[PDB]
Amino acid sequence: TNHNLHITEKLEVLAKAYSVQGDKWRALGYAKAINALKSFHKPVTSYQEACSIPGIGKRMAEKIIEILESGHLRKLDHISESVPVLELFSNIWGAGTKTAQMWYQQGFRSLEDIRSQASLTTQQAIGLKHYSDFLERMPREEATEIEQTVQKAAQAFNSGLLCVACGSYRRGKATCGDVDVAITHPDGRSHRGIFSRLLDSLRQEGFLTDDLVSQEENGQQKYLGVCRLPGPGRRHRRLDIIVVPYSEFACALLYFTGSAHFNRSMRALAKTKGMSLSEHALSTAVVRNTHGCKVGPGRVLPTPTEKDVFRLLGLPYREPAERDW
DNA sequence: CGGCGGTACTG
DNA sequence: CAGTAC
DNA sequence: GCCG
Numbered sequence: 001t002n003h004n005l006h007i008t009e010k011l012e013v014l015a016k017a018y019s020v021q022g023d024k025w026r027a028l029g030y031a032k033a034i035n036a037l038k039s040f041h042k043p044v045t046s047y048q049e050a051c052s053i054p055g056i057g058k059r060m061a062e063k064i065i066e067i068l069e070s071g072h073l074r075k076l077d078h079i080s081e082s083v084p085v086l087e088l089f090s091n092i093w094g095a096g097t098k099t100a101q102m103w104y105q106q107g108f109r110s111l112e113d114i115r116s117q118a119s120l121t122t123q124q125a126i127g128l129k130h131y132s133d134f135l136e137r138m139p140r141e142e143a144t145e146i147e148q149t150v151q152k153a154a155q156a157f158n159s160g161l162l163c164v165a166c167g168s169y170r171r172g173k174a175t176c177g178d179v180d181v182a183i184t185h186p187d188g189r190s191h192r193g194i195f196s197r198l199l200d201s202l203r204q205e206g207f208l209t210d211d212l213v214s215q216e217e218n219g220q221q222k223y224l225g226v227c228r229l230p231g232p233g234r235r236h237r238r239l240d241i242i243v244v245p246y247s248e249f250a251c252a253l254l255y256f257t258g259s260a261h262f263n264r265s266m267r268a269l270a271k272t273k274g275m276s277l278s279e280h281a282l283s284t285a286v287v288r289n290t291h292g293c294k295v296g297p298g299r300v301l302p303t304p305t306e307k308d309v310f311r312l313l314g315l316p317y318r319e320p321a322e323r324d325w
Numbered sequence: 326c327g328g329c330g331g332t333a334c335t336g
Numbered sequence: 337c338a339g340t341a342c
Numbered sequence: 343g344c345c346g
């Protein structure tokens with residue numbers, strides 16, 4: 001469906017360069033531009049046509065036409081030499097751009113330098129230890145196996161527990177970066193307490209190997225960690241689990257499915273219509289002072305299904321595969 | 326030009 | 337609070 | 343980077 005693949009391919013490189021350098025807004029504009037380019041019903045044939053597309057302005061149109069007519073993008077040949085290294089360091093889970101810059105500034109140029117000389121948080125050490133595993137997208141069959149491991153451990157405490165793999169898996173992609181499992185109960189009550197029990201059950205199976213984010217003191221809806229399927233040669237994989245009350249399930253699912261750019265656009269649109277959208281609920285506009293500052297949430301508008309959220313936002317419903325932005 | 330999603334942990 | 341993540 |  002992407003009729004501008006040669007253009008978007010080269011735009012994404014520049015976008016990634018801006019991203020690993022910490023120019024997050026520039027990268028955002030690029031992301032919206034590239035998404036708009038991939039959804040266009042036709043290969044772009046002129047500057048004027050490109051400019052008429054939302055998300056694309058003069059500066060982006062210049063590059064689009066440059067790639068269209070020459071087949072190349074000169075700016076790519078002028079990208080800083082630090083960028084491949086900053087990208088290398090950014091590929092470590094737990095390490096972002098500030099950290100990458102700092103490491104580069106300290107002279108580090110390889111994962112080996114990071115291993116032997118760099119100061120690493122617990123999360124960064126886990127990310128470094130499983131660098132290759134976490135960087136490799138898994139086949140969705142493996143994601144299925146992981147999801148059903150979690151589901152099997154969950155429904156053992158309560159067979160009525162609903163478990164849905166979200167993220168790229170739910171959007172139907174052939175490969176997944178990590179497994180995203182949402183859990184709830186139509187009951188409305190028996191979703192409570194299952195967090196500790198599920199985590200313990202998965203730990204005793206030897207399924208969970210590392211924890212990145214899990215605040216267990218709190219009787220907590222989110223877990224970020226690492227798992228590995230039983231059997232020889234199995235890779236470590238990133239696993240994220242959310243447990244939500246049924247009344248929020250639709251917004252949770254929607255959030256979890258994404259994609260992230262889809263979520264940002266949808267929340268922006270909600271904001272323009274005097275509403276607020278989060279993983280918890282679709283609500284009315286947040287409460288503000290004389291100053292523009294927010295001081296309180298808006299009133300929750302009940303949403304049993306994703307379609308209800310689309311409805312209350314005045315949007316045509318889209319299946320998960322149509323949210324793959 | 327200023328704003329750019331809404332949220333949550335870790336240390 | 338800065339950084340990072342979903 | 344784009345948009346209003």
Ligand SMILES: Nc1ccn([C@H]2C[C@H](O)[C@@H](COP(=O)(O)OP(=O)(O)OP(=O)(O)O)O2)c(=O)n1
Pocket residue numbers: 166167168169175176177178180255256257258259260263342
């Ligand atoms: N900045 C972000 C990152 C993620 N998400 C949400 C939407 C995503 O779909 C979901 C899962 O995040 P992932 O990092 O797992 O991204 P995907 O599953 O969509 O793709 P991938 O296969 O690369 O993991 O969380 C979001 O709202 N905002």
Ligand SMILES: [Ca+2]
Pocket residue numbers: 166167168169176177178179180
């Ligand atoms: Ca994922």
Ligand SMILES: [Ca+2]
Pocket residue numbers: 167178179180240342
């Ligand atoms: Ca994830």
